[PDB]
Amino acid sequence: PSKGLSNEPGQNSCFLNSALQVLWHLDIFRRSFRQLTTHKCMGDSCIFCALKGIFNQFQCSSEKVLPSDTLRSALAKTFQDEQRFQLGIMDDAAECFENLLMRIHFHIADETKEDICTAQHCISHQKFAMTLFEQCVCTSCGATSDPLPFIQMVHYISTTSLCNQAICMLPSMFGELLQNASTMGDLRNCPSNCGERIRIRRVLMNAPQIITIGLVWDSDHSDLAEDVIHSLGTCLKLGDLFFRVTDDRAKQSELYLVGMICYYGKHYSTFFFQTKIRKWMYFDDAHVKEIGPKWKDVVTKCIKGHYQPLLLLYADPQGTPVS
Amino acid sequence: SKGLSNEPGQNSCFLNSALQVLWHLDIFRRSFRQLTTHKCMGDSCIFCALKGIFNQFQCSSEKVLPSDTLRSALAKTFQDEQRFQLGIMDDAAECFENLLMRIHFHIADETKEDICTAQHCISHQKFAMTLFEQCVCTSCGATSDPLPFIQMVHYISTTSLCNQAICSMFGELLQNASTMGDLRNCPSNCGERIRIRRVLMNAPQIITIGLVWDSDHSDLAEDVIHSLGTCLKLGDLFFRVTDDRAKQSELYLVGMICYYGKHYSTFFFQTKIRKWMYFDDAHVKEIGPKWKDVVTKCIKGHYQPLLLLYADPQGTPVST
Amino acid sequence: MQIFVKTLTGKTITLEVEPSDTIENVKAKIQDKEGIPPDQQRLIFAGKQLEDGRTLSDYNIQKESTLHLVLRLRG
Amino acid sequence: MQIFVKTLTGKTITLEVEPSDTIENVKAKIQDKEGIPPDQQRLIFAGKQLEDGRTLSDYNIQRESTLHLVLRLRGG
Amino acid sequence: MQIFVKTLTGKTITLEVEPSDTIENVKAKIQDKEGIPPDQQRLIFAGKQLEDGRTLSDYNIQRESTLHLVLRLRGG
Amino acid sequence: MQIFVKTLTGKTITLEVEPSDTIENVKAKIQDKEGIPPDQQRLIFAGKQLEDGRTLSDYNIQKESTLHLVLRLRG
Ligand SMILES: [Cl-]
Ligand SMILES: [Cl-]
Ligand code: NA
Ligand SMILES: [Zn+2]
Ligand SMILES: [Zn+2]
Ligand SMILES: [Zn+2]
Ligand SMILES: [Zn+2]
Ligand SMILES: [Zn+2]
Ligand SMILES: [Zn+2]
């Protein structure tokens, strides 16, 4: 259901309301979260509990607008020492989105000796997280660097790298375009200094069903927005997104753009394609609007408003909720 | 002093030259006497042939002694590789080296890891050099994978011994000579070039040096004998020496095998007479007390020393 | 000690740094080279965001390590 | 226990191991099947590098689990 | 048994070990006293390079044995 | 794959070899560079002398390994 989130003068909650809309409208997340009964509760201040109360309202309430203040407060108390997501202070929607996924893992999984999440109920690691390792490899002399493995919830790519690689290419290529843009500046010397140069290689070993792309902007009033919006594709081939994709489920995976958090003028909003109405919705806190059934309708609005897309959410339509 | 026989076609002065050295080194002889156990090969047994020759060296009263018992055990043991065959002419340093190997094969319990720990093994306890090679770049820190091994003789080029001489403490001369053509790129190719380093890890009481020759008719012969030193400080033979005993170890030139026109001889210092001796198969002769005479005998016959043997004066044989 | 920073434009720059350097120290070096103010700087290493008050040694930032710079957009 | 080791060429090394086997133990089995020196071997599972001194059950590595073998080569 | 690890600088390390201790554990103990990563360590005994998978007993390394520590590292 | 050989002059030459090459092959290639017949060639690697018939891989001779050439003096 498409409802709005209230934002009063001074509480600066548009960064949270933008992320909340993505999480509620993402099918793999919402259906998964509903089947979740037990959680590591933090007490009167607890993100999971505040999130559940918001999600229950999104379905049972008849109000056209709902308050996110419970999650806003719980987020503030949880990050008091870090001085992030504090009450009355603006913040970043992608940082908010990342940390909500991270705290969902803390609420769902259990502390493992080696910090390895295998819980089949953890939405973040089972569906969102990308498991990668980076390595320098020289084809001429055969030298290789030490592999550096890590997990990320968002894949960040530079907007200028994206725009430049689009001009060079001038659908079904957006994955390759994203990969060439991400690797553009990753030139390094051979690990053994044969004299040749190498490109950092990223290898994905898992198979996320939701890829969250983060756009690295050059400015808060970017003059590259229009070129960025026109460079965005609606279909992502996961097998092309990284230099190597070793998991068979991910080689075959095709993910479609269903959501996009947008920044403009120190404010945040969210576009999302509701699969039911078969149309693109727009959520700016309390304001919910029908944009249209065509991606071009979203392009026209983003370009007219000088919107800067920050988070792109590609969901596998053949994806499944957590078991 | 005794001598060894070579029939006209025997061509056995390679063995005889090496047999004299082993009998005269006090460390090898006194060790070998306390040995009454060995992996006998039966007929092709080098130990028993060797034993038989050492019994006659001590008890027999003849001036010249036969070595055909070792020549057949050597030929039968190496019949699969066609080396030291009956009648053929062969290398003396090769013979001296394989004899030390064959001894160990007879005094060891065949450790699976191939290490040798036998307290009675003369070849490893007294003669062997356990070292490793490694490329170390002092500018960027990089370091090649260390290559360890055991060698029985340290081989040094003649063209390098002489050249370094042109350029008291001849241990540095041997070290400086042995590392002449050992320039390598840095293991991480930082741009620097380094020299291969070798560091000795045990304390051999007999250091045997091999001289790599350019031809059977070398014109460096005279200069090689002129660069040889009698006293060898083990602490300077290698880039580094880990064992303290070796660090303060000084070794004296005690014996040497010489080549000349498809023939072999042996010079040795009989300490019981304080005079250097000479053994050309069956012909024995006294040289004198001064090492200068060994030089004059050598440069007058165009001799080419193949093996030089240095012994720790304060050495000891194997222990129970 | 030499570390790399992937900047907002995709270019890779070189930071001369010490293991005992706080990341606020690193953010100041990035400001001089790249012009981005510190509060707008997001440093990611091995998928995790570096948080002020810590040093490079805390995160095992070693030589030739790469920091991924993301611009923070407060809203 | 049967565990699988994925090389970056796509070859799969099947290994018979125990949960109490260390990572150096696993790298020795890989050398027995491939001749790859353990010092070149890096093993990765679930986004974490596996430490030589720790065991397979430390990382909760179970039956039919897939480990990723990445090699460190000097080259030349 | 107290084994002796000798380094190129001249420092003679002493460690309390048992024959079961694999070479990797000897390297770990070395890291506990010098701070040298085992990946950079190479042990040598009687001219043979010891492997991290094998154990001291496999090399007949008896008590009071002296081992040689050589470091294989890269530059810069 | 290249290989280092320390000749009788104390200098080092470079030989292009493969690990499946017998040492009679290595000896023949040494002959084309240094002019010493293989029967006078003693090849030492890491203390042991290479016994004719084996291959370079049987002695674990990788790239950039250094062989010590030694003149055999039959007498
Ligand atoms: Cl604010
Ligand atoms: Cl690809
Ligand atoms: Na190891
Ligand atoms: Zn709760
Ligand atoms: Zn998780
Ligand atoms: Zn290279
Ligand atoms: Zn016998
Ligand atoms: Zn022995
Ligand atoms: Zn270097």
Coordinates of C-alpha atoms in Angstrom, one line a residue, chain C residues 63-64, chain E residues 75-76:
Chain C
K63 CA 50.8 0.4 2.3
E64 CA 49.1 0.2 -1.1
Chain E
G75 CA 59.9 -5.2 -0.7
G76 CA 58.3 -1.9 0.0

